[PDB]
Amino acid sequence: NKTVLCSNFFTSANRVNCLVPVDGGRKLVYGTDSGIFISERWPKDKSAKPRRVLDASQVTQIDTLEEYQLLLVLANKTLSSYPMEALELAEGQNSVAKRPKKIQGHANFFKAGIGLGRHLVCSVKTSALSSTIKVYEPTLKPFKEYYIPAESSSIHFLRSTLCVGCARGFEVVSLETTETQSLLDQADTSLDFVARKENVKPIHIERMNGEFLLNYSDFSFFVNRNGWRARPDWKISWEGNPNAFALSYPYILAFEPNFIEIRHIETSELIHIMTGKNIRMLHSSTREILYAYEDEGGEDVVASLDFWN
To answer: Which residues form the CNH domain (predicted)?
Structure first.
């Protein structure tokens, strides 16, 4: 099932760039080119509009550390924290809770995950050229920094290490110690299609049992750890150029700007294509996958996909 959550409020004036659920999924926080808004996921009153909570411009990425009651905001390349009370109804326009704390001045993307010891926030500067990675620990203090001689698409926490999606592939980087190694094994000949292509866009990594599902813009396949191929006869080549992925067993969903492609994880067969315009995956949780799309004219629409059997 697909359900439309909000088709009325966001428009061609000021589209939804990003979103994160808070308060156990009972509220949604939206980032746009002009501001940050909050609504109820299940409002009692259906004339309720999202409400503006922070002024901030060019908000391209947003997340939380719920344990530390921090809202994390990337706005016109500046990464900052706010306390979660910034979102309260009780707070007014000048209150000290809506004051940002600068974390890093210039950043292209970030990722907050558990990655030990403590748990963490990474900010990545990147160009065609190179990438600089900074890592932070709980009020937030710096911790470790890294350098990478390639353009980076993505970043993933893999227990004690960071796996960076960069133009040469997934490269594993050691939190304490080191230095760095590719994930895939050069001797595995069943992985030559990956090596054929240079360049690639590694986008997303997912654990299943003791295999990992690796998702790039061109293809998906499984490895074992030691990055040796698993299910060697199983391979998906995507119809489009997906920039995001989500797993909702037994389905794997690839989002590209003009369509969502849905495949069966066991058989690898095509189940459904959902066409549209300017499709952006917003957030994937055990609850649902939230995404946005343009509809005529000029509505911006927020929707939910949820699977059940």
So the answer is: 13-289
Q: Domain residue spans in the chain?
A: 1-309
Q: Are 59 and 43 in contact (CB under 8 A)?
A: no
Q: Please, which contacts does 35-44 make with residues 24 or more away whose CB atoms are closer than 8 Å?
A: 35/59, 36/62, 36/73, 38/87, 39/6, 41/5
Residues 27, 39: contact at Cβ < 8 Å? Answer: yes
Query: 136 and 113 in contact (C-beta within 8 Å)?
Result: no
Please check whether residue 121 is in contact with residue 140, taking contact to mean a CB–CB distance below 8 angstroms: yes
End-to-end Cα spacing for the chain: 11
Resolution limit, Å: 2.0
- The torsion defined by the Cα of 168, 174, 175 and 178, in degrees rounded to 10, comes to -110
**CA neighbor of 59 nearest in space, from 79, 83, 87, 40:** 79
